[PDB]
Design a protein around this ligand. Structure first.
Ligand SMILES: CO[C@H]1O[C@H](CO)[C@@H](O)[C@H](O[C@H]2O[C@H](CO)[C@@H](O)[C@H](O)[C@@H]2O)[C@@H]1O
Ligand SMILES: [Ca+2]
Ligand SMILES: [Ca+2]
Ligand SMILES: [Mn+2]
Ligand SMILES: [Mn+2]
Lengths: 240, 240
């Protein structure tokens, strides 16, 4: 299809079109990307991702068209302590993507250790909400919580300082305009606090014509829940 | 997802989200439901269907909601014979639906001979454009080409006279309003000729909560091409 759209105002238990990977599962009408114990408490060493089953036609080489897309979602992070880790990310990747071996902790379940910073070895565009930046393990991170745009590397091509708020839902809008090639990210808390980050990227040189979209999250030794509360997505192939 | 929509202005050869069954295949940017030879001419004894891969949430027991959906599509039929057969149908059925054994010809690839008229043994809602009505074989049909609404039986709950026009595209809009439970069908040719038929049906008593949507066509001894040219679909769960 030239156009595709879907909306999950909430996430009931009887899902049919979601691909669950790792520890991801539905709990209380929401998607819990990372594992939680009996009493809904976050645990260490866990990775989880979800992908929508239908493939998205991002660009078409024959017609020279590229899709414009918009992804709107909300999530909350909760942790018994304050150094919650590691973060959640919205990502776009080849249809057969799977959790890379040893991609836990700071790699957010998106990259493999040996190639995490090699752009020519990966095929992924992601918007990360990174809450852990200890320089001993996350050497590629700026020294503060941040939202970042990742293009084939865990080392973001662009970041903006962000504030982690335990238990508060963050509303996010990610938009890609094929006319300008700008990938824009706007995130807001209910009180109006806003964060913005954008980057120019030619999706045609990074990803295949057909892709899958979804979310990924992980917790290494430090932990927190990564709760995806709602998600809507729309894409339309356009002539630039 | 509570809402899902997709649009195929045309059908390029490179498809990822369509389930092909029987002889269905893409040719010249359109879906040829029934088999055609090298010259593109129709052949006898063929059945084919396509289904969109993502499942549609038609209704939800736990929330008392039923989907409002619309399906717009265009198709054309072509045959050198004076009595092209057998017809094309837009249908909604359980996700695991497959072509029933011996469902060729007048059964349109939707029903098995043994239970074709047993409403208690089927789970399918379809809108048929039936061009073959030989009273000796298709005993259940009115004696003329027609558009029919089929609910668990090849014997339509209601039909209206229709004119088959060789090589001309018919544009169809099928809508379902959960508030009135009306399934409406409006079909038009490019010269403004219009056909309309409506039926009240509670989809909750006929189909499961999750379903797949698609098209089916067949040709028995008599034949014609059944070419699906375009298709757009949208569905959203609403409170009733
Ligand atoms: C206390 O944990 C910090 O220090 C440890 C000792 O150097 C590190 O092993 C540890 O790294 C792991 O956890 C973090 C946080 O979950 C994660 O980002 C990293 O990829 C490792 O899994 C952390 O730096
Ligand atoms: Ca980090
Ligand atoms: Ca017939
Ligand atoms: Mn980071
Ligand atoms: Mn009929």
């Amino acid at each position: 299809q030239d156009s595709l759209s879907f909306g999950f105002p909430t996430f009931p238990s009887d899902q049919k079109n979601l691909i669950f990977q790792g520890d991801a599962q539905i709990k209380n009408n929401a998607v819990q990307l990372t594992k939680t114990d009996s009493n809904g408490n976050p645990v260490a060493s866990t990775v989880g991702r979800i992908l929508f089953s239908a493939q998205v036609h991002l660009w078409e080489k024959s017609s020279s068209r590229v899709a414009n897309f918009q992804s709107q979602f909300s999530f909350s992070l909760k942790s018994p302590l304050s150094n919650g880790a590691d973060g959640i990310a919205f990502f776009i990747a080849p249809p057969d993507t799977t959790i890379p071996s040893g991609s836990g902790g700071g790699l957010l379940g998106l990259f493999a250790p040996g190639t995490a910073q090699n752009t020519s070895a990966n095929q992924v565009i992601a918007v990360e909400f990174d809450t852990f930046y200890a320089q001993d393990s996350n050497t590629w991170d700026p020294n503060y919580p941040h939202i970042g745009i990742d293009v084939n590397s865990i080392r973001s091509v662009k970041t903006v300082k962000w504030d982690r708020r335990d238990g508060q839902s963050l509303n996010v809008l990610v938009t890609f305009n094929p006319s300008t090639r700008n990938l824009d990210v706007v995130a807001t808390y209910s009180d109006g606090t806003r964060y913005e980050v954008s980057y120019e990227v030619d999706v045609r040189s990074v990803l295949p014509e057909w892709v899958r979209v979804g979310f990924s999250a992980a917790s290494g030794e430090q932990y927190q829940t990564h709760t995806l509360e709602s998600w809507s997505f729309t894409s339309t192939l356009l002539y630039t």
